[PDB]
Amino acid sequence: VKNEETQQKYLDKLFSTPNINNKVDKRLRNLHIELNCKYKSKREMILWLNGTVLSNAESLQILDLLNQDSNFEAAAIIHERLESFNLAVRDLLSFIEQCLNEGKTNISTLLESLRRAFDDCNSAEKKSCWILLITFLITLYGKYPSERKDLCNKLLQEAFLGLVRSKSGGEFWEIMSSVLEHQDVILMKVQDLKQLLLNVFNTYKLERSLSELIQKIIEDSSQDLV
Amino acid sequence: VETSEIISKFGVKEVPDPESMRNLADYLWSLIKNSISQRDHVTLLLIVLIKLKDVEGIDTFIQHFDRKGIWNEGVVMDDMDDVTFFYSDNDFFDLDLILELMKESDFKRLSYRLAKKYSKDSLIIVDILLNLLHNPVKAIKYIKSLPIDETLRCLVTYSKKLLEESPNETNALLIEVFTGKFKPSTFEVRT
Amino acid sequence: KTKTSIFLLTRLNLFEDAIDLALKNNLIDDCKVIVNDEILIEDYKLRKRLWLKIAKHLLLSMKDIDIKQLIRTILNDSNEILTIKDLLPFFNEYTTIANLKEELIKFLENHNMKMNEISEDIINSKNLKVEINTEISKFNEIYRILEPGKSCDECGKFLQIKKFIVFPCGHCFHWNCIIRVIL
């Protein structure tokens, strides 16, 4: 057929339904895998990658094809499907850095990406990955001039909350102290670190403030019901 | 339905979540728009306002809030230097906790405006203006625009601090106070 | 006079000036004793200010030496006041990373414990409310109270002549004897 998109559409419904039981073709599967790269819809590419057979050779071919592509999210998803926690974390960090450099991701989108990255880190020897992610975030915050300072502070607060919910974690907090050793590697200005610590403490106090009011309202309602 | 039932599904998660607390703030705004003036609720209405970086969501509340605790549009006169300012206490958001929370952030510049709306705090207004807001000329003017001669505790409490910046004006004020010249004054906002 | 002036200032209700003079005179022990002997209470606000001033005078005064030990001793003597957050602004520039990290870890652990307790309390309150609502719903239209063959109480005459104001635990009233009792 002298039209690639017609072949793509024909092969779409061929493998869309898993009802196939007697499959004998092999060249067609490879052709479909190779020509799926011709699809320019990144969102549809991610949707297709959400559900697939994902053979080991097929996974390797998909990773090789996506190496040239800029779809870092697809690579991270493939790594997660491949149980590559470190690779997925690295891909997520690279995607976050690219979004920050572009300066087009929304605040809500940035928060969603940070939440997804925190969930992926918690999924995973995860202490080393968390330390590396914290170091990368600190380096990105330092390199980026002050706009993204609020985003960096929010990311730091989210990382602290995740570390607290992991158990600080005792020695993991010492790992954070070991991360402080990497801070000695950074050797940043004392004023910036003091300001960041003060902001974190103020945010923690503000977050804890509303819990008392919520508990008081709940207790009043419970007493009235009783 | 009951309010706490609605509030229960919120909270729990304290992630930045602009949508969640935006919806909570809208629900509280609609609740306070018509009736149900629970003392705690409005306090929470302030806290979430401090949680967000919005500013116009606070002054508008001050603009259309009655001194006696009625939410209605139209700025009108109030019983200044009266029972509402000296004897009557009424009910509203806890100023001390709210003031501390505001001072925690850097939004304390407009807090001086919020101090006027809140009653009492006769000796706290000078402290907020002098220590925090600096500008000793403004503090001296406020002390001149203070209440009737019965309002002498602030002078006896902060004369030592006042006499460091501008002794001449402080000396004149002290001489006027001690010489029987206790007449009031209008209020507005090297020798 | 080092001591006479301090005593006169204390008797003159000028504790701020007395504390400043004691700090200028390097009478740390006397100032600490005066602070701990604060019989007068001003909602701890004046006490907090005095403690902050004393800490600032102590801080950046001599060599750090046992900086972590000195900071821990000061915090312990503060008696649940002047937390590490307040001392952070006056920390200036130093290399006491370990003590600050330990304090931050302790604060984070306390905050996590408080959040867990709040969540547990909220869950318990929700469960109690659900149980109360279920009990109230079940109690509706399930009275199933019974009248005995012949019945009466309080009035004595007969239950079935005026009305059937009946209570649990087997009591009967005429709707008139009860209103007579309350009067």
UniProtKB/Swiss-Prot annotation, chain A:
Ranges for the CHCR repeats: 1-146
Q: Where is this protein found?
A: Golgi apparatus, Golgi stack
Q: Which family does it belong to?
A: Belongs to the VPS8 family.
The record's function comment reads: Required for localization and recycling of the CPY sorting receptor (VPS10) to the late-Golgi compartment. Involved in the retention of proteins to the late-Golgi. Plays an integral role in the complex vacuolar protein sorting process.
Q: What else is known?
A: Present with 736 molecules/cell in log phase SD medium.
Protein name, entry field: Vacuolar protein sorting-associated protein 8
Species this chain originates from: Saccharomyces cerevisiae (strain ATCC 204508 / S288c) (Baker's yeast)
Curated annotation (Swiss-Prot), chain B:
Disulphide-bonded residues: none
Function of the molecule: Required for vacuolar biogenesis and for trafficking of hydrolase precursors to the vacuole. Mediates transport at the vacuolar membrane where it may be responsible for tethering transport vesicles on the target membranes. It is required for gluconeogenic growth of yeast. Acts as a component of the HOPS complex that acts during the docking stage of vacuole fusion. HOPS is an effector for the vacuolar Rab GTPase YPT7 and is required for vacuolar SNARE complex assembly. It remains bound to SNARE complexes after vacuole fusion.
Protein origin, superkingdom? Eukaryota
The organism is Saccharomyces cerevisiae (strain ATCC 204508 / S288c)
Q: What's the family?
A: Belongs to the VPS11 family.
Assembly and oligomerization: Component of the homotypic vacuole fusion and vacuole protein sorting (HOPS) complex, which is composed of a core of the 4 class C Vps proteins PEP5/VPS11, PEP3/VPS18, VPS16, VPS33 associated to VAM6/VPS39 and VPS41/VAM2. HOPS associates with phosphoinositides and the PX domain of VAM7. Component of the class C core vacuole/endosome tethering (CORVET) complex, which is composed of a core of the 4 class C Vps proteins PEP5/VPS11, PEP3/VPS18, VPS16, VPS33 associated to VPS3/PEP6 and VPS8. Interacts with PEP3, PEP7 and VAM7.
Q: What else is known?
A: Present with 1200 molecules/cell in log phase SD medium.
Protein name as it appears in the record: E3 ubiquitin-protein ligase PEP5
Residue runs in coiled coils: none
Q: Which residues of the intact protein are shown?
A: 413 to 618 of 1029
Q: Where are the CHCR repeats?
A: 1-171
Cell compartment(s), UniProt: Vacuole membrane
Curated annotation (Swiss-Prot), chain C:
Zinc finger spans (RING-type) are: 152-177
Annotated compartments? Vacuole membrane
The entry's function note states:
Required for vacuolar biogenesis and for trafficking of hydrolase precursors to the vacuole. Mediates transport at the vacuolar membrane where it may be responsible for tethering transport vesicles on the target membranes. Acts as a component of the HOPS complex that acts during the docking stage of vacuole fusion. HOPS is an effector for the vacuolar Rab GTPase YPT7 and is required for vacuolar SNARE complex assembly. It remains bound to SNARE complexes after vacuole fusion.
Instruction: Spell out the note in the miscellaneous section.
Output: Present with 2020 molecules/cell in log phase SD medium.
Q: Which family does it belong to?
A: Belongs to the VPS18 family.
Q: How does it assemble?
A: Component of the HOPS complex which is composed of PEP5, VPS16, PEP3, VPS33, VPS39 and VPS41. HOPS associates with phosphoinositides and the PX domain of VAM7. Interacts with PEP5, PEP7 and VAM7.
Protein name stated in the entry: Vacuolar membrane protein PEP3
Organism the protein comes from: Saccharomyces cerevisiae (strain ATCC 204508 / S288c) (Baker's yeast)
Name the gene that codes for it. Answer: PEP3
Q: Which residues of the full protein are shown?
A: 675 to 857 of 918
